[PDB]
Amino acid sequence: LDPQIVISGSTAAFLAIGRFVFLGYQRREANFDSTVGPKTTGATYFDDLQKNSTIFATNDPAGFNIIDVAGWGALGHAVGFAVLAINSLQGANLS
Amino acid sequence: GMLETPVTSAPIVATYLSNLPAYRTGVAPVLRGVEIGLAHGFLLAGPFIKLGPLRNVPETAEIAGSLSAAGLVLILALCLSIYGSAQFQSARDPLFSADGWSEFAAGFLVGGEAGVAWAYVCTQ
Amino acid sequence: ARPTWLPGLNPPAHLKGALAGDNGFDPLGLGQDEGRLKWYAEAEKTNGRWAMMAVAGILGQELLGVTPAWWEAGAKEYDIPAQALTPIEFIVMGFLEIKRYQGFKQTGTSGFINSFPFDPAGMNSPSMATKEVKNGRLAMVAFIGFCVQALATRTQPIEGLTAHLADPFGKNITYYLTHLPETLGS
Amino acid sequence: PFVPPSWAPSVFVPLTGLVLPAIAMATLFVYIEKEAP
Numbered sequence: 001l002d003p004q005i006v007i008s009g010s011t012a013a014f015l016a017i018g019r020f021v022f023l024g025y026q027r028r029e030a031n032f033d034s035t036v037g038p039k040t041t042g043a044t045y046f047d048d049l050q051k052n053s054t055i056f057a058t059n060d061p062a063g064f065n066i067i068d069v070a071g072w073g074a075l076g077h078a079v080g081f082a083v084l085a086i087n088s089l090q091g092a093n094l095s
Numbered sequence: 096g097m098l099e100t101p102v103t104s105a106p107i108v109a110t111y112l113s114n115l116p117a118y119r120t121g122v123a124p125v126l127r128g129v130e131i132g133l134a135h136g137f138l139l140a141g142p143f144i145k146l147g148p149l150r151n152v153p154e155t156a157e158i159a160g161s162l163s164a165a166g167l168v169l170i171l172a173l174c175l176s177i178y179g180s181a182q183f184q185s186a187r188d189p190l191f192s193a194d195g196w197s198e199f200a201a202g203f204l205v206g207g208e209a210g211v212a213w214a215y216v217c218t219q
Numbered sequence: 220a221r222p223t224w225l226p227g228l229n230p231p232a233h234l235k236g237a238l239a240g241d242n243g244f245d246p247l248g249l250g251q252d253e254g255r256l257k258w259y260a261e262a263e264k265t266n267g268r269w270a271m272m273a274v275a276g277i278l279g280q281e282l283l284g285v286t287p288a289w290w291e292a293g294a295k296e297y298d299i300p301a302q303a304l305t306p307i308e309f310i311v312m313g314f315l316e317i318k319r320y321q322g323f324k325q326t327g328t329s330g331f332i333n334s335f336p337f338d339p340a341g342m343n344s345p346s347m348a349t350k351e352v353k354n355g356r357l358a359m360v361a362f363i364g365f366c367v368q369a370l371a372t373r374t375q376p377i378e379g380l381t382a383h384l385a386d387p388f389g390k391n392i393t394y395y396l397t398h399l400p401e402t403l404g405s
Numbered sequence: 406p407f408v409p410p411s412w413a414p415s416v417f418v419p420l421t422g423l424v425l426p427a428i429a430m431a432t433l434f435v436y437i438e439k440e441a442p
């Protein structure tokens with residue numbers, strides 16, 4: 001199989017559904033983590049290491065920041081190589 | 096007052112100076128540095144190539160002379176920089192200030208070396 | 220509203236913009252203790268300063284026809300035996316670095332031997348501080364590029380650039396990562 | 406062990422005759438011109 005089509009194709013699908021299908025659902029479940037509350041309430045260096053010091057703002061209308069791009073892109077790459085690797089096993093000698 | 100004279104006070108002379116990069120206010124010091132550096136850098140290559148110690152070598156004369164012109168521009172850039180450090184330690188034009196002159200010296204180095212390189216390309 | 224590494228991203232609070240080259244880039248929030256950020260800021264420059272000299276040295280050695288490649292310099296034998304080089308380096312570097320640290324603790328700035336700051340020529344200003352960091356960061360990225368390009372391509376920095384320029388689409392990271400047997404079999 | 410390399414003059418003569426003097430003169434010129442606080 002052509003790696004460029006399969007890997008890019010799978011990544012596009014996983015980015016497309018993530019942006020257009022599961023974005024609303026994913027955000028709602030992320031608020032279920034708000035009900036519990038913040039991890040720590042302190043002002044020491046080690047307490048600062050547990051806070052969202054940097055907020056990744058995005059200009060995308062739906063709020064599809066880079067962290068979401070990395071998450072859904074990784075799944076597409078993972079699925080893409082699974083498809084390629086399995087298809088490679090066809091026509092393998094002594095393997 | 097001072098002794099009036101056409102050379103000191105003439106219309107044609109005054110207009111010519113007012114258009115030179117040094118006297119053309121409203122331009123960023125860095126840009127003036129590049130404009131001044133290019134002009135001097137281009138000329139600086141001439142004498143080194145024609146009258147240098149390797150002037151009679153067919154092809155090495157161009158390279159050696161220009162490479163020495165580049166060196167002199169580097170030394171001049173140092174002179175400009177340290178002059179600003181000594182002169183401006185504490186007015187109308189931004190150039191005559193510690194911040195302005197430091198930009199001016201940097202532009203001269205960039206413009207001067209570009210002029211030396213541009214002069215070499217003209218030969219070959 | 221200074222430029223930030225990510226469009227439309229307000230910089231984090233612990234980054235105030237006072238430091239030279241402060242683009243608000245700290246996704247992991249490593250620098251948030253004022254006692255560590257000051258140490259890291261000094262640590263950024265010294266890594267960059269060594270990188271800047273290293274990149275110039277590798278490029279200079281290649282441009283001047285020095286052999287062998289920069290990653291085989293140690294194997295070559297010089298006037299001084301390799302055993303004698305290390306004790307000399309350890310004593311000299313230990314002295315310079317120890318006094319480098321002592322001055323930093325007292326003054327909080329960077330210098331050489333007994334002078335802090337070390338600015339004999341008087342060139343020093345916020346612009347110069349900014350220019351040092353940006354050129355330093357570029358050298359740090361550049362040096363890693365040399366190391367990895369030596370691993371994959373096994374060509375010296377300038378040599379690799381010429382190959383890319385000669386054949387841009389034919390020669391690139393795509394070609395070398397799929398031709399390790401050919402390049403390493405030579 | 407002591408013998409320096411055969412190329413030592415090529416580096417040290419320009420270094421001590423053209424480079425260090427330039428830095429030394431720049432250091433001294435800035436120093437003398439420097440104004441007291």
Ligand code: CLA
Pocket residue numbers: 360361363364365367368371372374378379380382383390391392393395396
């Ligand atoms: C800015 C420095 C720089 C520049 C100008 C070049 C230029 C070149 N590289 Mg090199 N390279 C660099 C950095 C650089 N490289 C780095 C950092 C690495 C390590 C990943 C490599 C690894 C590398 C390899 C393995 C190969 C090249 C090759 C090449 C040539 C073809 C271009 C290519 O394939 O690039 C595409 C691939 C790259 C890895 C280049 C990336 C360059 C960007 C600008 C780096 C950005 C870094 C970023 C700011 C870091 C953020 C960190 C984050 C955690 C915040 C070309 C001469 C190829 C060649 O023909 O060499 C002779 C080749 O085989 N480079």
Ligand code: CLA
Pocket residue numbers: 142143146147148149
């Ligand atoms: C004033 C006296 C004088 C003159 C004219 C020369 C001339 C020369 N010497 Mg000699 N030299 C002298 C004194 C002099 N020397 C002395 C006292 C010593 C002992 C320390 C030496 C030691 C010496 C050595 C060791 C060497 C020379 C060499 C040279 C040659 C190249 C110099 C060079 O690169 O200049 C570079 C020139 C410039 C950067 C510019 C010169 C000035 C320009 C032309 C002024 C133009 C002004 C312009 C007209 C104003 C216009 C204004 C308008 C726009 C309003 C040349 C033939 C070299 C050689 O190979 O000779 C064959 C060489 O190796 N000389």
Ligand code: CLA
Pocket residue numbers: 147148149159160162163165166169418419421422423
């Ligand atoms: C120890 C001190 C010293 C040294 C090492 C030199 C060295 C040199 N002089 Mg002499 N000179 C000196 C003192 C010195 N001089 C003094 C005190 C005076 C006044 C009395 C003179 C007056 C003088 C004149 C009038 C002339 C020389 C020239 C020369 C060159 C003669 C050999 C040749 O053919 O070069 C050929 C040169 C080259 C092929 C290029 C060499 C490299 C250039 C000059 C610089 C490159 C810089 C680089 C690109 C960027 C910066 C690098 C740096 C940061 C490391 C040579 C570069 C001649 C010459 O050609 O000068 C340019 C010449 O005409 N000198």
Ligand SMILES: CC1=C(/C=C/C(C)=C/C=C/C(C)=C/C=C/C=C(C)/C=C/C=C(C)/C=C/C2=C(C)CCCC2(C)C)C(C)(C)CCC1
Pocket residue numbers: 011069070071072073074077078081
């Ligand atoms: C702007 C814009 C746009 C566009 C966009 C784009 C084009 C994007 C892209 C994106 C992308 C393109 C992304 C990507 C990502 C990726 C990633 C994130 C990856 C990851 C990976 C991984 C993680 C891997 C792993 C692994 C390995 C390494 C080995 C083997 C195994 C595995 C596979 C697992 C649009 C028009 C739409 C809209 C408007 C705007």
